[PDB]
């Protein structure tokens, strides 16, 4: 475990996630202290919501650390899919909290109860320094995207709380409180839609969207090879971000040059961006 | 609409599944209503847990009907993975809420009895006992998780029975207890789904793969084996790829047929053997 901490600081994203998690946990200890000073009334709720956040950054950091592990017998492809899984979990996290924020609006829609706003401001400043840290979220693509979306959702929630509060005291419009929550849950769901679509596509063994538009041309170029009869059973999927795996079976002439066909097919799919290609070659009867 | 109303009358097992999900949803609505009227966090937690059990059954049916679909250019492998995904999603939605339940517990533990009719806990016990009795006996990772969750629901109903008879506060302890039980119930389904989604070598294929590699190496004119990748597409559907290096004059037709035989006997449905002739 002593060498684990050196590995965490070695990586850029891993160290950024570790620093953000530690800062969140220090803000956590300070918050929980102010709570156990009998002011816990909404404080402890905020404390466990933020602990859930800390769990989200912990999941992202663990995915980043695991993704660099060497492949083994059980995990032939390595642990790179832990990146994609993170982007699946984080998005699936942000929807869930969204609904609760939705539900929270209902809690102040029928009979809203009026139950010193400073902790929201420090949480906000935490959120601005976090989004400054994770500006890259525009294999660590799904991890950074999910973590940036989580930070954006928390920043939005702070904006909503602050806006509702400033209409509470200085302006006194009670109607505008639930609608902020409704709108902002809507906004975070629309924010997490694309990451979830890409993660679901990757995990469903779907053809990579970037590779999908250039695949018929590759099939045509493979068809034009001398001695190739037909193509079948072509399967292309995404292992991790920008890493594509492809498999295909060619029928060829009974006396075709298998070496040259293999080299040309691999070249054709290498210019297309396929990193791992398996071309089975079957000689025909005639 | 009306066709589905008469279709389930013709069959029996689908009618039993419909009764299962309908009673689950109805009693979930009932428990949510009573927990809103009262302040029984254990009752609300059981409502959420079962609510999500019923959604697990419904999403399993939806995943089966989607996995029935055909493959196309975008989805070359079909929509079978949805099955796995459904199970995975269930676990996530079973781990989030339960953890959040943890929250409400410990929160309440720091800083509204309303007994009214607290006897619905034994009704939930009877319903969960009926459910686990009915479910006591490709749909592997769709309903095994549901069976584990209904067992956890029976245990949670026993826990809320204990909480109610103690009420005549022991509610936060039973809340964190059911949260722990839900987590330990969803550990194995999540482990299986994570293993499949991480492109891991199929566990039923692991111990037979060294023998397959040794038998493939024994084939005449094979020099070495490279880049062996095996993974689970869906239940009992394995995909395997490997690159053979062979002699410059090796019988590639025979080696291909023998390698495919070796891996077909081991249960690999789809196999891709790339044969590379060596220079020497």
């Amino acid at each position: 475990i002593s060498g684990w901490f050196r590995s965490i600081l070695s990586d850029k994203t891993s160290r950024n996630l570790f620093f953000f998690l530690c800062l969140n946990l220090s803000f956590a200890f300070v918050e929980l202290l102010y709570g156990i000073w009998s002011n816990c009334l909404g404080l402890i709720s905020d404390s466990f919501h933020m602990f859930f956040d800390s769990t989200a950054i912990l999941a992202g950091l663990a995915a980043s650390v695991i993704s660099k592990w060497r492949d083994n017998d059980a995990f032939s492809y390595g642990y790179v899919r832990a990146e994609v899984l993170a982007g699946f979990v984080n998005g699936l996290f942000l929807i869930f909290t969204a609904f609760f924020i939705f539900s929270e609006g209902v809690e102040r829609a029928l009979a809203p109860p009026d139950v010193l706003l400073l902790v929201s401001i420090l949480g906000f400043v935490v959120n601005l320094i976090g989004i400054f840290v994770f500006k890259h979220g525009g294999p660590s693509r799904q991890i950074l995207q999910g973590v940036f979306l989580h930070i954006l959702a928390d920043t939005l929630g702070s904006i909503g709380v602050i806006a509702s509060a400033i209409m509470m005291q200085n302006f006194g419009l009670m109607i505008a409180d639930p609608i902020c929550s409704i709108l902002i849950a809507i906004l975070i769901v629309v924010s997490v839609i694309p990451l979830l679509r890409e993660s679901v596509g990757i995990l469903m063994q779907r053809t990579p969207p970037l590779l999908e538009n250039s695949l018929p041309q590759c099939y045509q170029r493979v068809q034009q090879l001398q001695g190739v009869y037909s193509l079948q059973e072509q399967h292309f999927w995404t292992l991790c971000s920008d890493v594509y795996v492809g498999t295909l079976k060619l029928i060829v002439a009974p006396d075709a040059d298998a070496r040259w066909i293999l080299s040309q097919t691999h070249n054709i799919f290498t210019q297309a961006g396929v990193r791992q290609l398996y071309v089975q070659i079957d000689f025909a009867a005639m | 609409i009306s066709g589905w109303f008469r279709s389930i009358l013709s069959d029996k097992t689908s009618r039993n599944l419909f009764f299962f999900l309908c009673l689950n949803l109805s009693f979930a609505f009932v428990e949510l209503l009573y927990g809103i009227w009262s302040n029984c966090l254990g009752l609300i937690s059981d409502s959420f847990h079962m609510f999500f059990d019923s959604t697990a059954i419904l999403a399993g049916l939806a995943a089966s009907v989607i996995s029935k679909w055909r493959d196309n250019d975008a989805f070359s492998y079909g929509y079978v993975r949805a099955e796995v995904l459904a199970g995975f999603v269930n676990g996530l939605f079973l781990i989030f809420t339960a953890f959040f339940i943890f929250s409400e517990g410990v929160e309440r533990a720091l800083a509204v009895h309303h007994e009214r009719l607290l006897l619905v806990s034994i009704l939930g016990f009877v319903v969960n006992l009926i459910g686990i009795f009915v479910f006591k006996h490709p749909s592997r990772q769709i309903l095994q998780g549901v069976f584990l969750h209904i067992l956890a629901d029976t245990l949670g109903s026993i826990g809320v029975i204990a909480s109610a008879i103690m009420m005549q506060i022991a509610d936060p302890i039973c809340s964190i207890l059911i949260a722990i039980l839900i987590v330990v119930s969803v550990i194995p389904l999540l482990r299986e789904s994570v293993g499949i989604l991480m492109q891991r070598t199929p566990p039923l294929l692991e111990n037979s793969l060294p023998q397959c590699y040794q038998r493939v190496q024994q084939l005449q004119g094979v020099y070495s084996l490279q880049e062996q990748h095996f993974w689970t597409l869906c239940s009992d559907v394995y995909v395997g790829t490997l690159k053979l290096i062979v002699a410059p004059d090796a019988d590639a037709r025979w080696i291909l047929s023998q390698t495919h035989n070796i891996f077909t006997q081991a249960g690999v449905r789809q196999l891709y053997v790339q044969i590379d002739f060596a220079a020497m």
């Epitope: - | 002699a247 410059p248 090796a250 037709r253």
Partner: antibody, heavy 118, light 112 residues
Framework: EVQLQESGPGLVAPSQSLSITCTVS????????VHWVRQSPGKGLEWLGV???????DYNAAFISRLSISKDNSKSQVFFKMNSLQADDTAIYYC????????????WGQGTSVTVSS | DIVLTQSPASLAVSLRRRATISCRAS??????????MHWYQQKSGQPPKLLIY???NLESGVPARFSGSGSRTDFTLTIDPVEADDAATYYC?????????FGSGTKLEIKR
Amino acid sequence: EVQLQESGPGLVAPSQSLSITCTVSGFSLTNYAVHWVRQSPGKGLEWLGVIWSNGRTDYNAAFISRLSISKDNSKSQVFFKMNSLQADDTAIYYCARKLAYEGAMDYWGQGTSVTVSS
Amino acid sequence: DIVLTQSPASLAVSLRRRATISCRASESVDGYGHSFMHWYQQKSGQPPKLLIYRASNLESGVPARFSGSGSRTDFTLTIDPVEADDAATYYCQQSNEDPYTFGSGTKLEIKR
């Protein structure tokens, strides 16, 4: 011009060793496998083994304990050594070039008769 | 191993007729549309000469009067028309399994 010529002792004492050198011409040992096959009036044609271009050797399982095939590409020679020669080992031994990308033997040597007697 | 039985043991055919030699395999020597069965001819005091490979393919340079057919476990070598040079022993060899095994042999006798 593809040619294989075997040279070995016609007479071998029982329980001794037999050594045949097959010289090849017209093709390289660096891209062709060479099979060893014996023919006797009793057991007919029997496949003994094959040596591959990288030096991999495959043997008939009935001879795994007493057979060894080696080669050298520089002089284009294949060496066939059998041990514990018995009374039924008297046969005509051929080194045959494998047919490329097939399981057959496209070219054969003239063979050497080996008689195991005292 | 795979046992190959050749029937008949001896065959007598006249000039310009058809000769049929049959090889039976104990187990299938087929794989994915390829029958790994080969036919050799051995004349008087000569090494065996390959005639057919993969049960239907003529070796380059052998005459067109030779033909092969069959699949799974039944294989046929056909000589049509039969010449005087075709007096020899004909062998079937499978290469679908280790070890390679040869047939017992069928001696073709020329009738005149």
